[PDB]
Design a protein around this ligand. Structure first.
Ligand SMILES: CC(=O)Nc1cccc(-c2cc(C(=O)O)cc(-c3ccc4cccnc4c3)c2)c1
Ligand SMILES: [Cl-]
Length: 241
């Protein structure tokens, strides 16, 4: 591991504070601007949709990435939530109510067992089964996110290969002739400190770079900084053009 406080400039310039953690898979080396915060545990918020999707798929709660989850007809304040969704769009638009139904059908017992099998965070689902990742007891650090993401990438999690391929498909965020990004955003507001997440990885021709970042997010106005700051670090380290 190596600490590179020069990255702190990317947060300071936006009057923000946070951590970026990078892992070079070929060289098995990690890099971060803040070793302490890289190991501080936060609510996973919507980044939990990764493990939740894996479990729902492996148990048959979700048949496949085409199954339609019909809008329940309750108008919510995020327009894209008031519509039918499948796994792909539910991930893309971080559709909480779809994933809350997943968790209810999963149930406490199976959720707890699977999170321990995943070695996911503190593996603590204390709270309500349909909201614990937003205001319950579960916590995960940036370094712990990378550990989990690396297992998913290599199909080494204790679910089927199919379940892992589908979730990695649903994580697809950006792709061009230079790189592919599979990732999931998060926004934790119910428990202080309010933070934004972005965790995932960058696929190159002959390497993969895992990343996990969180940053202080007092207002939703700064949510775009999650990706922007992360990409500035990637550019600085010459991982992307
Ligand atoms: C119910 C609960 O626990 N909330 C929660 C749970 C899971 C995900 C999110 C969430 C994620 C994102 C994201 O990942 O980008 C963005 C927003 C969000 C929220 C408010 C906004 C206001 C103006 C403009 N844009 C906004 C955007 C919310 C919130
Ligand atoms: Cl894909």
């Amino acid at each position: 591991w190596q600490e590179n406080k020069s990255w702190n400039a990317h947060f300071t310039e936006h009057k923000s504070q946070g951590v970026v953690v990078l892992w070079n898979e070929n060289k098995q080396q990690g890099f971060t601007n803040n070793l302490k915060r890289a190991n501080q545990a936060f609510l996973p918020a919507s980044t939990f949709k990764i493990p939740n999707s894996l479990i729902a798929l492996d148990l048959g709660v979700v048949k496949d990435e085409h199954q339609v989850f019909k809008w329940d007809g309750q108008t919510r304040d995020i327009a894209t939530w008031n519509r039918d969704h499948n796994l792909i769009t539910a991930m893309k638009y971080s559709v909480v109510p779809v994933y809350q139904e997943f968790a209810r059908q999963i149930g406490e017992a199976r959720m707890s067992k699977m999170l321990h099998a995943f070695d996911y965070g503190n593996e603590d689902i204390s709270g309500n089964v349909d909201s614990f990742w937003l205001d319950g007891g579960i916590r995960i650090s940036a370094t712990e996110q990378i550990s989990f993401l690396r297992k998913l990438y290599h199909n080494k999690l204790h679910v089927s290969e199919r379940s892992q391929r589908i979730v990695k498909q649903a994580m697809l965020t950006e792709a061009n002739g230079d790189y592919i990004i599979r990732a999931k955003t998060g926004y934790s507001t119910r428990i202080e400190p309010k933070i934004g997440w972005w965790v995932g990885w960058v696929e190159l021709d002959d390497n993969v770079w895992f990343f996990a970042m969180n940053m202080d997010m007092p207002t939703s106005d700064g949510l775009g900084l999650r990706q922007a700051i992360t990409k500035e670090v990637l550019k600085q380290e010459k991982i992307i053009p």
